[PDB]
Amino acid sequence: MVHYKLTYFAIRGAGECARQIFALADQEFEDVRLDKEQFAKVKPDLPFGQVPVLEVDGKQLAQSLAICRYLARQFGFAGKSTFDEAVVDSLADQYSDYRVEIKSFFYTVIGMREGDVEQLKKEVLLPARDKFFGFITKFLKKSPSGFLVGDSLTWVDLLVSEHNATMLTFVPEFLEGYPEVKEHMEKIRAIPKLKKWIETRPETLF
Amino acid sequence: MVHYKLTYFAIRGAGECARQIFALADQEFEDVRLDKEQFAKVKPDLPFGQVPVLEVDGKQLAQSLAICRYLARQFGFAGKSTFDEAVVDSLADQYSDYRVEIKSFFYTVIGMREGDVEQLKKEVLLPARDKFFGFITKFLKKSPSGFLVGDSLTWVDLLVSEHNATMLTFVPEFLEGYPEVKEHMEKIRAIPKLKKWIETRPETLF
């Protein structure tokens, strides 16, 4: 069959969505986890000199979003129509904008950058999250099934549920003003094959 | 009969790549260009409070990339295989990473934010275009046909060529060490249905 290989760091981060799609599909893949120094050696061979990279039968595909969308389409977690597919897409991009907003908080909290936590929480993380969650919860309120688009799992469900789960580990009161978002993170993560993966996957933080 | 409406500002920006596919596909649409006050009355009703928004028989879709991809799939400008569609997706995502890096210089020229144009250009813009252009050149040099993916026009071809033409009007030597980038811009813009649009669309600053 198709051979899949995902090359990324030894964290969840931007590789985890792919992993979560594979586990939802019962799809074997080679899960290759690099440290900093091995990234430095292989990166000139990557399409944009960056991880995560997906090879399918040796053919490279980079960019988490493009990878996550591709695998979802292959295994039917993209949306049930091309329009719902675009809607999934639009939420995943809104999520990414958010992530750009908070890049200075996250990289400080994960100990990879210099800065003041509580202050970067106040001025950068909490605003950015309010806007993002404000929009996310409108989608959730118009969804009786609890999934972000339609009434079936799509790849954004994973992006957002997994990020929230990670955040709680750094910011215990992250879901404070947002009961729907919390309900969503628990609904997605209790999906048996996903649940199995969260239990068995390598343990990192973030 | 499918009715399309594009809602955006009186500006090229995030709306234009949608407009260009509509030009290539010979597809009628309502080009709705709003001002400050108009946007503000409508803002609460947009899915993430932002334009561009596309209405497809009344269904809203936000986020420029989600929008262009969806349009591209409809009219055969997305890629020839779902993998190629992935690779186009990833160059679009790289393009946007590069727009995030250059934001600071972009809002300065545009007269949106403060900051020095000698500084920001040397320090932010040109090293970022250097990184990015090496990528685009690599895909170009891999292509016998001139497009960035495959032997056919794709929607990242439109985003990349429209940004270069735009940047060219703030930075006269953006593109000086980069003949194949220039040839790509010239080649995409000469496509007759797109040429006619560039010549007939309203003239705006950006």
Residue numbers in the entry:
A (entry chain A), B (entry chain D): 1 to 206
What does the paper say about this structure?
The primary and tertiary structures of Na-GST-1 are more like that of HpolGST than Na-GST-2. No such density was observed in the electron density maps for Na-GST-1, instead scattered density were visible in the substrate binding cavity. A rotation of Gln around the Cβ will allow sufficient room for gluthatione to bind. Na-GST-1 was crystallized at an acidic pH 4.6 whereas Na-GST-2 was crystallized at a more basic pH of 7.5. Evidently, Na-GST-1 is capable of binding glutathione and like Na-GST-2 is catalytically active at pH 6.8 as measured by glutathione conjugation with 1-chloro-2, 4-dinitrobenzene (CDNB). Furthermore, the cavity is more open in the absence of glutathione (in the case of Na-GST-1) than with glutathione bound (in the case of Na-GST-2), suggesting a conformational variation upon glutathione binding.
The fundamental/active units of both structures are homodimers with the classical GST topology of Nu class nematode specific GSTs.
